[PDB]
Each structure stands twice: as structure tokens, then as C-alpha cells.
RNA sequence: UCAGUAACGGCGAGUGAACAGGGAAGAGCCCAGCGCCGAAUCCCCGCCCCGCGGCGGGGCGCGGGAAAUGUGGCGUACGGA
RNA sequence: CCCCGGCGCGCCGGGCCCGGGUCUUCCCGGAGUCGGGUUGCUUGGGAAUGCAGCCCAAAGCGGGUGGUAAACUCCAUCUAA
């Protein structure tokens, strides 16, 4: 058919050629590096876990995952931050099982 | 008290506004001072252009102004990179640099790249040591003609591509401008729910199938 | 005092190998230990 | 902050300059302004450009 | 000028034009818009219906550039191009119609008020009204959409 | 790379290691006077990333500020006003306790310039901050171009005009839609401009 | 200029910004950190030459000190080595 | 006619031994801070614009923002302490 660019609709906009360039280096901020992961895993060996993290893990051992999130969320503050935190502790608990199994 | 028909007015004079009145009786004296600092600056940097560094072209944001272009802050690193100008050398020879600005499309990128190349073609460059020219410097003949420039460098102007009269086709005559717009609004409004309904529909029948 | 001497002798040697040495500091030593370039690390107790 | 200054439309200000120039060429009006032009050769009085130097 | 104002004529007349009985007191009735729902209710109801109350949704952070959409009617459509543009098209024989780009003239939407001359034209705009497109089509023209 | 481990180590303030060190050090800090010259930065990593350098002319001070809000200092709690201004408790001070710590260090050592500060510990009653100060007349400071800025008379008592990092946090500065109060450089600057009547000659 | 506007408000009295646009002016940069360089860094003392009413420059001292709990060079998100 | 200043041209002794393009391998960040709860003030900022006290208390394809609270999900945009 005949079709025009339109100021409304799903394909709205004046048509231009998009140009692809490397992302600005400021956009990699907060990317984990193997050295910074190694340093954080070392501090985790020296220091350990916080009392709230340990209490969360006790909830996760008995498979109280829903209650574990609510405790974590109440302590860290946000759902997304808690979801990421619950996952790490479960990964830690999973690793401890494997190490014991070995 | 109100009196017959009248506008309801809410003047904002319930503070101590007289303590903070800014008269403008120094306006002509400000205008002279600003001009006198433009002249002493033009003399100070001559033959460099009085206006200042060359600025790029940029399209104004929002739908109210995107039909217009103007002078931006400075050329972007992608623009300078494509034009073979070192970013630290750009400011020394009258070119402005904007590390923040991103080039999203090619055409705008190319327009500033060409603007740079045109500017580099008009640049008359005086040797660092007057008696010892160097590789990139302008010849002594074209230094005798180097005169200061007034006004913005290579002024930016909104040019319109004129289209001549052409015979209207049956395809164009048949196009439905109103219907096309109204249907486009509907499609972009019901897209998300329609996709949801299609997904649920498949699930409902699949459980019947399996 | 004796690094000044070595440089002066280096000038005499010029006008006409690095021996092994300890490494001081927690910043220097930590980087060496991560690189596995240290054979023995001594840490003060206080 | 009494309003000392007044805006006058450019079109009117130019009008006022045309009225002044038109009036300046009529002996009756220039006489009636008190000027002693009873013996100037002509109105308007145009002299050669030498007097500019 | 103060020489043309009432004060000069009111010299010698006691009360200065505010009456002997009611006098000129400081603020009888209140200051500003006091009393709208009270001793001043008739004036507000009589002359400012709708003044009190709330209506319609709030919209935080309104940006008036988002709804920029200047409009032009069809009766003004041919002024956006020079005169010789129209006369040349009307008298030529090949049937070629001129292009009127209303965005270049600072308009986005084309409205239908008025009638067009019997002369084909190609119109470019972001938006059209339904009657604008019909009227534009009635003279042999076409509507072209731009983004 | 030791400064990386220390930075990460001090992020685990609830670990067993850190709890022991904070507890004992808060106890020690609590046996001294409220303003106390310190011999070296308690936190070499934190101090240096705030601008400190381990050279003559940089000095450290430890300040002890009482915790809690600002009680309105009115006799017998009477405010003599309207009910909206009857509050005596639950009121808060506009500036942080880190800022107040810098001001107390800054006022005491009037001949020194305050660079920055950091948190070293706290208990239920006291917050402890170490403040970095610079002697603007030592020659290790005046002759180094990178630090000649802080010797200028415009930088006298930065902590007392809300110019330090801690001090400038209560001023509501920043870019974007969240900080429209301080367009023009400051709240008063925004207010003056917005509350001044521009009467042009031709109006 | 947006704009007495979006908004706030016994939604009463009242209060009330910003983006975009046009101008004045126009300028950009530096650390910590990550690294590598024999601490390559700095202050003060005495003697010698120049200068000495903005106390500095150079040469010499197995002269003292700060500094490996980190000074200087390179380098900082536009990436850098 | 005096003085100060500025702008230029030469000599002595110093410092710097300096750059660009493409490949290859490497490195890259600010914590009792963010964010969350509550309280008080504050704002036009309205299920909370900013600030502060107290409590909780982070992460690293993370974090902040995207003007109506919240979950899932894409985008865009910056890179705080
Ligand atoms: Mg009346
Ligand atoms: Mg009236
Ligand atoms: Mg009478
Ligand atoms: Mg009377
Ligand atoms: Mg009267
Ligand atoms: Mg009366
Ligand atoms: Mg009155
Ligand atoms: Mg009150
Ligand atoms: Mg206050
Ligand atoms: Mg904060
Ligand atoms: Mg800032
Ligand atoms: Mg208006
Ligand atoms: Mg009411
Ligand atoms: Mg107010
Ligand atoms: Mg603006
Ligand atoms: Mg300008
Ligand atoms: Mg470094
Ligand atoms: Mg940046
Ligand atoms: Mg930063
Ligand atoms: Mg108050
Ligand atoms: Mg208020
Ligand atoms: Mg929303």
C-alpha cells in the first residue's frame, strides 16, 4: 500500500538512520571485575556474615523462603534489593551443602 | 469589595515587595559596558573571530521545536574523530568540543562532520614561530589577507527543500489521512491488551487440547 | 647516603644487575602476594 | 520606580519625522516658528556637499 | 497627568467625593476577595459561576511543548504559499499540483473551516480533520502525512 | 592493593571483626576530651580518598558530638506564638552532626583550613568524626600547585559557610528536578530572584 | 519568555516553580582508587654564586627530619596503561 | 617634564627529553554512604520536593532518575556518597 511517516502510532517519528557506536565508558560502571570479585571473596572469608544475613539463612535452611524474603526486605528495605539478597544467601547455603557433600 | 462585573484578581503583593524592587536605570550603562568589553576582547584576540569558537548544528528537542536547528555547545568526539581532529587540538584552532553530546543518527553526525571540514578549509593558521613556518601552517601569502571575522562563524540557518508541482497519482488521491491516523492511534492504544488476549487465548485452548 | 654514592659511581661508569632486596609496605607487599611474586611475607604483630 | 519612560510605536515615530520634514518646507510654517527666513533663496535650502568638509 | 484628574476639581469640596454619611473608611467588606461564600456571595455567584469547587483530573508536571499543535483552516491554506504559486498552477495544463507544507509554515494540524478554490493541491501536515481531508479531496488534491 | 581490602573491610561493619574494633575504639574515644588532636588518620584509606595526603601540613582532629535532635531553647517550653510553633521536642537541626563536628574543629583551630571529615564510630550518646585540616602556611602546602587553592582567603572557614562536603549536603544543591529550590546557587539566591520585582524602564 | 502557568491551598484567603525557546557570557579540569617506576617525593638547617621592600633560583653537605600506616611521575570514566 | 605599567627583542644558568594512527594483552572507581521505615521542618512538588534526628542497612550487567503507591517486564538516561 501507500504508507507515510506519522506523528502517532507504534512507528511514530521522523525517520533517520540510526548510527551504532561503542557504548560510552561511563556505562560500564558497577561491572564486576575478576580482581574485585577476588577481593570481595577474601573479605567475606575474613569477616563472615552479618547477624541479619545469618538469621535469613536459618529461615532459608528450613525452606521458609517467603518468610526469608519478608525478613530481608524489612531489613534492607526494597523488594528488588531483597530479591537479590535472598538469592545470594541461597547460593551460599547451596555451596555449603556441596562442600559438606565433598 | 467586588463591584458589578469584573475580573477576579490575585495580585502577588502581600509580601514586602518594595524592599526588593529592581529598577533598570543602569540598563544603558550596562549595555555600554558590555559592548566596551566586546570591543576590547575583539582587539585582544584578533585576528581570531570576535564571536568565538565555531559551534555545531543541533536539532532542538521536543515536538514543538524539532523542525528547527540552532547552534549547539560543541562538536562531539565522534564528529571530531570522523573529521580527523584531535579533541585536545580542537580548542586551540577555534573549534568547540562537547564530550557529553552523543550522535544518535548518521545524518546529524555527517552534517557536523562536513561543517568541520568546511571550517578547516577556511582556517588561516599563523605559524607558532613567525619566522619559522611548519607543516600545517598557512602560506605567507594568505596570512596577509587574514582579517578578523564578525558574527557567528559559518552561521547556522534553517533551509527548506522546495518541492515543485507534480501531477497527483491515484495512489495518493486514494490515501485516507483521517482514517489512517485514527486507526494508528487505536492500534498503538490496544496493542498491549490485544497481545495479552492472544496469549491467554492460546493457553485456554491448549489445556483443552492437551 | 649510599644511594647517592651508587649514582655518582654510575656517572663515573658512564663518563668512561639489580641485586635482590626486601620489599616494604602493605601496599607493595599485597600486590606482590597477589601476583605470587613473594616467597616469604613477614607481618608486624602490633 | 515612577514610570519615567514611554514606548512610542516605530510606525508612529517615523510618521512624526515625516510630518516634521513636510512642515519644514513650507515658508508659512517655518516663518510661524519664529525663524527669519524672509531672504533665504529657496525652501528646502540645499547647499552643495562642499560644506561637509 | 495629575492636572487632568478628579483631585484638582475636588479641592474645596469636603469629603473629596466619598460622601458625608458613609465616609471613606479603610477596608469595609474585607481585603481582596474576602467574603466570596459570605457577604459577597451574590457578586461571585452572579458574575463568576464555577469559581468555587474542583473539576477534572490533576496532571502533575505538565509540559506544554508535548501538546504543541498549531492549526490552520483551509480558507487560509493558500496564503502559506506565494501568489504566483497559485496562479501558475491554475493556468498550467499538465495537471501538476503544488505542494503546500504546513509544517514549514509552523502548523501541524489542518482544519476544515472554509472552502478551497477549484485547484488541485498536495498538502503536507502532521494531522488533518476529517472534513479537511474531504474538502482537500473535493478539489482534486491529496493529503500527505509527515512525522 | 591494600587500600582496596581496607575499603571493602570497612563495609562489613556488622562483621565480628569490625564490631570488636568499633566497640573498643568507641570506648577509647569516649575516655578523652571532645576535641582531640589525633596522631594519624584512624582510617588511612578513607582519609586519603577525601583529599588527605601523608605530608606535613595535614593534621587530624577527633571530635565528639552529642547525638539526637535539637530541642528548642525556650524557657519552660513556652514559645509565645501560635499552635503551629509550639514544638519543643522532635525538632531537628538543619545540618548534620558531621557538619557540626567540622565546625567545632574549624572554630577551634582558626589558623587551619578544614578539608573534610569522616565517621569513626558512635554509641547511643556520641558520634565520633575525624576531621582533616590543612595548615595553609606550611611550605609543603604553599609550594605545591595542586594544594595552593586552599591557601586563598576565599577559602577561610569553609565548614562555617557550608562549603565542605558534609556542610554542603544540608544546602539542597544538585542538578535536575529535585533541587529547584537552589537554582541561582542557594535557597536565598533562588528566593531573591523569584521574589524581586523587575520594573523595566519601559514597561 | 514560559507564567500568575503545572501545582499547592479551612481547594478559602492566598501561594506558585521547572523543561523546551531567544539572548549576556563562555573554559575547562584535578585526585583517591586500579597499576608501574630502586621514594624516583617533600620540609628545615649551614656554606658558595646571582637576587634580595612578594625571601626566590642554582651548587654543595656519610647535615636533621617527614614519608612504605604511601610522597612524586604517568593516569580519572571523554576511557586509561 | 617626571613616575608606574604593559607589550616585544637578545644573553647566562637551569628543567622537559615529550607526539599521532592501528593492532595485542591488560585495569577500571568514593559505605554507617545509598536505599528503606518513622519523626519534625520545608517545598508548587501532590501515597511525601529538599533537609535533619533515630532505627534498619546494601549492591556490582550494580546504583540513581524516568512528577500517583506497588509487582512483573522491557526501554532511555546518567554514574552519587
Ligand atoms: Mg462600592
Ligand atoms: Mg468595574
Ligand atoms: Mg456638591
Ligand atoms: Mg467626613
Ligand atoms: Mg465619588
Ligand atoms: Mg460605605
Ligand atoms: Mg479604599
Ligand atoms: Mg499560622
Ligand atoms: Mg531552616
Ligand atoms: Mg542523602
Ligand atoms: Mg558539585
Ligand atoms: Mg499568558
Ligand atoms: Mg471552604
Ligand atoms: Mg511561601
Ligand atoms: Mg532553559
Ligand atoms: Mg551569544
Ligand atoms: Mg593513584
Ligand atoms: Mg564526567
Ligand atoms: Mg565522584
Ligand atoms: Mg519552621
Ligand atoms: Mg510552609
Ligand atoms: Mg507512574
TrEMBL record, chain D:
Parts forming coiled coils: none
Family named by the database record: Belongs to the universal ribosomal protein uL4 family.
Its biological purpose: Component of the large ribosomal subunit. The ribosome is a large ribonucleoprotein complex responsible for the synthesis of proteins in the cell.
Subunit structure as annotated in this protein's UniProt entry: Component of the large ribosomal subunit. May bind IPO9 with low affinity. Interacts with RBM3.
Protein name per its UniProtKB record: Large ribosomal subunit protein uL4
UniProt gene name: RPL4
Full-protein interval shown: 122 to 174 of 439
